């Protein structure tokens, strides 16, 4: 049967405008939705349904076949208390500690569970037409739709019933679920890990992304080690230390600023004194320690900031309170994006969101160093994930860019 | 009697917590009552309305002008339907067809039945003679004229009826609008008339009437302010009102008409009139015209002198968009497939900002054109931009934000977009180092700005009516004025550093403009930042 699902007290269904799509994506959606209609997964609806949720098409890795993706963010926040409080899925802290975690897609199983009849009207979407020449096609879902946060919540029971034997056979294999994605963490070799992933896939078959969190640590703040220091070197060092003093309290820069005294030329070499060298060493020792009292509150929002460093380099920080970072990292992957900033940014946002899913079990809110118009125009052309994080746009250059490079 | 095919109704409900309309009936004359009775008798004879007994249904007002039923209080309480159509099809996106037939269905809403469970809410009363007998009660059995949900239900029914005929006739193309249908084909004209007759026979199988045989409109069609010709399209003539007392509403209507004309007329400028529309005080407010605005309207009438037409879209040819800078933060563009045969044209105005440069505005215009083209043709055009490959490479590789332009090529039509200055990444060896500083007193508005250098060069200038940020900008400007072609500048102003790292070439603040003009004349400029009040050597806050 179906589980009855309702909305929050006093909120109406999602009425979000469909954004324009290219002709190839419209054709792919037409074909996919015709096939899904032939299989009862969706059904056409009339004008009595005023709800709409955007939809587009993507391409996964190593696959030229299109995939349908619904931007269920608005509908997810319209039913935020269902998938979190009432039927929430716990998050194991042992997944990030495992060596190799592989991500799989389990969305094909969601289509086997029928959806509550009273809630289908809220999953309405519109395949658009070019130049508005014809009324766009409108569908509603009859089964659990991919990308909805209530779908894994509802399917959790069936998922446990399916995974119980494999879990009891290999207890050291950690299993987690988020949206249509299934994360499987293990401490095995890549070969035997692939064989175990094949075994788990064949196990899922009869019932109806290789990550390595072991190679990731919170990056510390490193100060240069030079034999001769110019005025510009000491000025940059003092700026970086004054910045880090907002994170580490015991930082002092007075003996280093004492060297800059006077109006020397920027390129002039200034020798370090004993007090300045001791101050630099004490600052190094202070920076070697972790940050004092940094906790994770599951009720607060996760915030991810990203800085473009040039030459394909990107730095990022995930935190909840300013200057109290929960994670920091860099990104420099040469996978066909040397001449496109937006594609690099999209792949970096995807990687950071996946890491956040693994470490805390929920996506962060991004602050992208890009104009709203450029991002909103182009981000759908490089997206490959079934989920979508929230984001805002910073349009003022942060001075702290080089303090993370 | 041949039985009409069955069409299914659309279930309609009311908003939650809202009852049906119960409004009084305004008094009407006796001639109006007679006309309403004459109309309603034949309407019930046709089967579009039914007579209800004097029970307790909902009452809606009715006037006579041809009758009129006002569901104003019903529209406030009827549920929300799906958006019928947000935007109209654009002529430049249409593909050339040998024949195009327009079919306007008559008695559109009255040919589709109403939800039986909702007919009791669509009831009105005709006042009788002298109010000595009870009024005449009527209810609607079909979609009423003026009801909120009539267009959506009508278009959904039309789509559902049209689907099989369009599917079985792949050699024609049908476009469905509100109350019209547009059927285009590349068939032999006799075959086209045969297929149109078959389509209207198909519509009559479900009981939908169209203009019989010919008698239907022939090109050129007047449609939504457009003139559609067999091989071209344009807009209907634009009427520019001319008065020596330009009011605010006149400028609003003129901006609307000029934006409407700019889609095919290249070179339309509407900035000088939006500048007069900046104020929204009075709707009847006479506003004079600036000389810039006068020359603008003169060249606008010079452009609207001889007519221009756009062509239709061909999928087999490439889609090209070319951009030109008009100045004063304005850009124009043309979308075409062949030289001198534009599909359409347009303009872009810069956003409301304090600082900007041409590259950002060009990127924004490219994004706008990209979105519009994806709406109209479903693809992104190849661009011709007045900017060199090397300039764009330097920009996007040194810009702190992420940015991207789709496939494009350099067209050498001035004025070209260029980078006017580039800051160094490392301090300059042999260049003088100017430690600058500025500060103002918040109470007295008195301040000072100046510099000290490594060669002993110093300057402090006092200033009246200034602020800390202004004195910091002034200090940097003084360092730029008195320095050679290569210079290092040290500042503690995060404000000035952010302004200069935004890389502007035009600003609202004239001080920033002078700083930009100084940077333009420089060979190498390295701008270093240090924390303030930290005893850093050259930073002389004591000089202020
Ligand atoms: N009034 C009005 C009206 C007519 C249409 C309209 O017509 C078409 C329908 C189908 C098609 F395949 C092409 C069409 O038009 C292409 C341009 N064209 C025009 C005239 C001519 O003779 N030949 C020619 O190619 C399409 C639309 F989106 C809105 N319309 C409003
Ligand atoms: Mg200062």
From Swiss-Prot, chain A:
Q: Tell me what effect the entry lists for residue 234 to T.
A: 96% loss of polymerase activity. 45% loss of RNase H activity
Please tell me, according to the UniProt entry, what happens when changing residue 210 to A. Answer: Complete loss of RNA-dependent DNA polymerase activity. Complete loss of RNA 5'-end and 3'-end cleavages
Q: What is the effect of changing residue 287 to S?
A: 31% loss of polymerase activity. No loss of RNase H activity
Instruction: Describe the effect of residue 179 to L.
Output: 90% loss of polymerase activity. No loss of RNase H activity
Q: What results from changing residue 182 to V?
A: 22% loss of DNA-directed DNA polymerase activity. No loss of RNA-directed DNA polymerase activity
**Which residues are Mg(2+) 1-binding?**
105, 180-181
Site annotation Essential for RT p66/p51 heterodimerization: residues:
378, 391
Phenotype when changing residue 209 to A: Complete loss of RNA-dependent DNA polymerase activity. Complete loss of RNA 5'-end and 3'-end cleavages
Phenotype for residue 60 to R: 10-fold decreased sensitivity to ddATP and ddCTP inhibitors
Give the consequence of mutating residue 151 to T: Complete loss of polymerase activity. No loss of RNase H activity
Q: Which residues form the Reverse transcriptase domain?
A: 39-211
Which consequence is recorded for altering residue 182 to A?
Answer: 76% loss of DNA-directed DNA polymerase activity. 60% loss of RNA-directed DNA polymerase activity
Task: Give the consequence of mutating residue 181 to E.
Answer: Drastically reduced incorporation of phosphorothioate nucleotide. Loss of pyrophosphorolysis (reverse of the polymerase reaction). No effect on RNase H activity
Impact of altering residue 184 to I? 25% increase of DNA-directed DNA polymerase activity. No loss of RNA-directed DNA polymerase activity
Changing residue 162 to L: what effect? 80% loss of DNA-directed DNA polymerase activity. 23% loss of RNA-directed DNA polymerase activity
Substitution effect: residue 69 to V: No loss of polymerase activity. No loss of RNase H activity
Q: What is the effect of changing residue 180 to N?
A: Strongly decreased RNA-directed and DNA-directed DNA polymerase activities. No effect on RNase H activity
Tell me the outcome of changing residue 47 to G: 74% loss of polymerase activity. 86% loss of RNase H activity
Effect caused by changing residue 379 to L = No effect on RT p66/p51 heterodimerization
List the ranges annotated as motif Tryptophan repeat motif.
375-391
Q: What is this protein called?
A: p51 RT
